[PDB]
Amino acid sequence: PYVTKDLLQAKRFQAQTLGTTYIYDFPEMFRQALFKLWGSPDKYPKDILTYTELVLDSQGQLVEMNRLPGGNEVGMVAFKMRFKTQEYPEGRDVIVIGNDITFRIGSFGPGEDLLYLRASEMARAEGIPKIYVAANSGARIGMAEEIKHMFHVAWVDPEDPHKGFKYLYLTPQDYTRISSLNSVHCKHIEEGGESRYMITDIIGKDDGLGVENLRGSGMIAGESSLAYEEIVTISLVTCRAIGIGAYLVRLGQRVIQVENSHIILTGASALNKVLGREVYTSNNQLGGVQIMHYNGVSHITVPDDFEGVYTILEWLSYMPKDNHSPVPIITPTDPIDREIEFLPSRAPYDPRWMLAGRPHPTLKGTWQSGFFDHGSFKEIMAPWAQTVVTGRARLGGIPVGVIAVETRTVEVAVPADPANLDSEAKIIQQAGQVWFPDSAYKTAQAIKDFNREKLPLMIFANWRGFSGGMKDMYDQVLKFGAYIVDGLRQYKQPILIYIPPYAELRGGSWVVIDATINPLCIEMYADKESRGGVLEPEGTVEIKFRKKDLIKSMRRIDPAYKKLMEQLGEPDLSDKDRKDLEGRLKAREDLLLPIYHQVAVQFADFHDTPGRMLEKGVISDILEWKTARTFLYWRLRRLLLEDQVKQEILQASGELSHVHIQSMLRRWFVETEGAVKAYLWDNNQVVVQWLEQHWQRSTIRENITYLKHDSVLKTIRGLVEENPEVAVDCVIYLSQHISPAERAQVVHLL
Amino acid sequence: VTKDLLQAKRFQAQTLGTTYIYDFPEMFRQALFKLWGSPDKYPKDILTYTELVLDSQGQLVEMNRLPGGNEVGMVAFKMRFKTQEYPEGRDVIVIGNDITFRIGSFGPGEDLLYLRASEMARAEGIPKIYVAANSGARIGMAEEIKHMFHVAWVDPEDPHKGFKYLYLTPQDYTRISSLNSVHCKHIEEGGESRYMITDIIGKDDGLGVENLRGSGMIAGESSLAYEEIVTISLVTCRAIGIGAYLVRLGQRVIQVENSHIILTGASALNKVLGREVYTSNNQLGGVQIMHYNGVSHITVPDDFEGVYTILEWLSYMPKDNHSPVPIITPTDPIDREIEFLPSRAPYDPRWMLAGRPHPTLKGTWQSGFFDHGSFKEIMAPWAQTVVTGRARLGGIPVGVIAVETRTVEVAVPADPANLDSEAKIIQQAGQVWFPDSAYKTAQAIKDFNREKLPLMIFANWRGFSGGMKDMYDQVLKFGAYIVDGLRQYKQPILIYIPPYAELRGGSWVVIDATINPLCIEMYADKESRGGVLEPEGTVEIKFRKKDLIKSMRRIDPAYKKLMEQLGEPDLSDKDRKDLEGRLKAREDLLLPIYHQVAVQFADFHDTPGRMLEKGVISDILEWKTARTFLYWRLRRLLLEDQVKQEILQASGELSHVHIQSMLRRWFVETEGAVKAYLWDNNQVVVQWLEQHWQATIRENITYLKHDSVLKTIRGLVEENPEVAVDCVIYLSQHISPAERAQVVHLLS
Ligand SMILES: O=C(c1c2ccccc2cc2ccccc12)N1CCC(N2CCC[C@@H](C(=O)N3CCOCC3)C2)CC1
């Protein structure tokens, strides 16, 4: 019963004027975004986008159907979508939930809450991404309207109402109507020898008025917490997100906020009324882009709903079809065999340029290539914690999370507090190559988030340590520093940490990143022109090469300081000669000392080389930036494949040792390829070529076959050994579905 | 050795304002004595301990030998001490730096001991106590080269023209080449051959980047330890760098007063910053900062009282991570009433928890909710809007979260490094979550969940602090963390809205039962309140001026009489304008009065009555009886979860629908269907569980094992018909000769 002229036109106008998109016009928007991503009419596949509406049936379960648009029994709609993308030409599935803002200002009733619940639950059922379009007014609020205009007031003094009232009540005739409906609890009182029904509680005939709504928020709040742990969650904020709306967005983490919009818990109109003054001017003042985009809650901003949708697909580009598929590697137009044109220097630079490249400064149309595949690097949480840069990219078409360090002094404009006229906007300096509380957090968030995308991670390490002065310590830098340790510990994909040219990893920043946090996943590489150590060289000298040592160094190298020999060696004691040289030696001491300190600092530095890193087995290999792209490509591409064989199958069958499994994989290489060819196992490329002989009579799967079969041998032997009572009744179970021919085989054996 | 080693090293420790590492065991004994009260109340062998020691193959071997002689800057003991809740003993692994070894620095060997000792703590599921007195990762240089290198100057007789490179003579290089101490390229400077230092490696191990590695290792270990076992930490002198990160990664931390937790010291920062900004290390990481920011859970005046807190904290916690929370027979009887009465006006939450000195009495105590003396607070000075700690209800240990109702004043300190910033005083409203109350709340929830404790939230929140500064300050992030924390909770969570307490809006949402329906039970006091908005706000939206007017038309005789007069329109404009004026007069008079009646009408929706009808709460409760009621419900819920989660779940893997129905169905079998209603009685149920299980007891549980094991094997054969006929003929080994004829006819 939904009419196009009547229902459709008006509802879209109603979303149009709210500055949002009517919920049933999003599927079509997704169709249009994909068409752009494919770049033409002549490059477009058959069914770019298939969808189906998820609809709650009479017993609160979802049922796929594709009725016409509109006509939804709750103010939320869900769709199961499939769309042919470049990473998945034969399709990838996805679930989109979103408020019908036209329906009761997008309020959250128990019915709405339920659909979102089942939609989310299903998404997790199939391990596929959950897109949520936030356009709402938070939990629904209501009263007992029925009873609102029945109740009478027992005044303390009917002449003077400034003197208040005793209670509220209903007369017997009033109560008789509402009696059986159990709308109202009230104690039968007999004031003035007259019968009244003194209200004690008000329930309401109608459902979805109060506390039930709050529970129903927490329910979908909870669900949304779990889903962030299990599947991909992306969220689009278009008109507004309030309270339960806001919390849903945030629990999903990844958030695309449209500019007009806001993300609030309590609106300015409200806050003004509680506080008592005109404190806040707008809802955009509280939770608009210029707050959330700048504090990390919103990962990225978009100018309109369409660029939202487009980013959603743009994000899903890097991420696996589901939470049991691998990351979509695509054939790159950007060559792996090339060099990186952009070189990072002792001159401070935007780390974006080394990642994504930049326009060639000394040329017209030329581009300076960065480390990643041209055009692939897409940043998130940019204006927050600008001391670190986080985002995703592609290396030879392999998707990957990126973590880079800013090397220019950053400034941050913390805004003045509107509930405090004794405050103003402050600007705060932030040093390059330093973890602050905000960078520490952002860095840990990126790690937490990317891990959930099953993405591999590339950290371009260049940190001198954590900020450690009072304010930053007070501001809990230590807590967030420790989450970097928590985050990498729990990572389950390859992490490649790489110190670039003229970059450095010093002290506590090395500690929270070191390979031994996650031996199975982390590999640490230093550039030929990088540095690393506990302290900086100046500091090492300050502690471990002090003045006493410096004068000794003089006593050795500097020939002039053989005044010392002249001093002590020959026995001659005169106030003249003995006191003369005594001051004259000090003379030279003073002249040489600052320059020997400069030597001392160089001596310190020569300890901090990648030369020594490799020697003390802390980094895997020493690289060269020009040819680092291609090295890390084949290494990344191998590690992904080794990881597939091991976890996916080998561990999903043998349940055997990780040290053991590495061996058993190499054991197979040497076994079929020969001992004479064994050395090549250390060559990344050749190993990838050999791996596809098995993965893509499979030398490797024929082995996994034998493992998983022999594994179920020991599994049934353990139970029957543990539980000899079952064995007898068990043989008859296996006999029901054995084999009529082999049934006699057994039937005669024992 | 005794005088030389012991007296010296003790003086050496003394002068650094801390205890010698080997003297700690005796403090634990001395602490234990104070914990037991009188010497008559002592137990047999109060403390037993062995030292853990690395062997030739880097593995911990227990031994008992003379103190001193630790061959690495780190020491650790395995201790068994007898406590009140564990009279026959409980185990822990103590581990700490030797500040007297090498400024208490961390080298690879020091790291390895920590690694192995923590690994062991996790292996055995037992707590890991960590004593911090250190100086972060060890730093060193290739001394050998230090004493051998030469400088190739730009000009010999004026070294201020600088130097080209450093180098070794070919002679000197032939002493070193075997040792791999230094890498260098050959070079000729005016026909003299020189070996130009390119890299310096060092003969002696443990100089630089390898120490960071070894730090990163025990950080990773520490990070995991917090997930598996209880982890406590005491900073006695200073924890530096890696030492600061271990202390933090283990979360629960006791800081002695003049000590500090830092990364880079005040000295270093001053040089780097360019002026003498910081006067002390305490200024960066002393009690005054770390206690006020959540890093330090509690502060102590000395080591002894520090060791005591360790015992005092462990007293709430289970002996290992596969044992249940230690209930002890209470002295404060379970059946009394709570004498403190939460007021409509603000009060100190702690009073309703711990009780207070009777204001109108001589030496009387006003009882609180929990056992007397039993509530101990953590993170007191930080995020004071919320209160976190541990208490006991009838001897049942339990994590505690309570809300502040008075106004809070946080005295944020001036950053010496910023010439502009002077100190400030921030007011923080009560009954409100802030970026810190939220953080503290979820931080308490995660800490306590790892102790395997039950949680008790005496909820009293009007909502999250909205508004710009708090929203800019990421309140929305930490608010979400409360959801995650209760979602992941694995013990019982009892939420009680006490008398004159309220639970509103987003504060309801992030604390609801549906977040974790297997653990969270919600209760509202008879005089408590709850709902979407405050009544003042409900009225602002759903009971507006036009509507207040409609009420007056209905229910005000004066007002109603005025209308009646204008209802006979046959009068002069004088009378028409007058009565119009009068009626406006009357509605202006009444609007503030009717606003009050409208808020009260709104308020009658927010009642615990309604919560119960709409099923958001499990029961309405009365503060006097609150203590006794919850005690039995907690005790029941614990036993139920004990049988269920431990015993019952080990057998089958079915849903919790059976586990509940089945547990009850068993009760109704052994106790009759007439006596079925008592399943709703907590005490009868507690009595029942003990008298049967602890003292279909494990006959029904046994029967679960067969149908489960068979089920398991079925799926494997369903999955792999490959295995079928090899297993069937492997199983001709297992079946009996008499059982053979049993099956041979049964199958043929
Ligand atoms: O190596 C030294 C060091 C010196 C470094 C440079 C010049 C002089 C130094 C003198 C030192 C003296 C003693 C120990 C270490 C020293 N460090 C001292 C400073 C250490 N911090 C690393 C982290 C970033 C910096 C830092 O914490 N800041 C920078 C931002 O504001 C907060 C304070 C410096 C790095 C280690």
Ligand SMILES: O=C(c1c2ccccc2cc2ccccc12)N1CCC(N2CCC[C@@H](C(=O)N3CCOCC3)C2)CC1
């Ligand atoms: O119900 C109302 C509400 C009013 C409450 C009390 C007095 C006047 C109110 C007026 C309202 C008007 C419109 C909607 C809701 C209103 N609330 C709106 C504000 C909500 N916040 C709860 C959290 C604490 C408060 C808050 O955010 N503050 C607390 C003090 O610090 C600054 C920020 C307000 C609580 C719910």
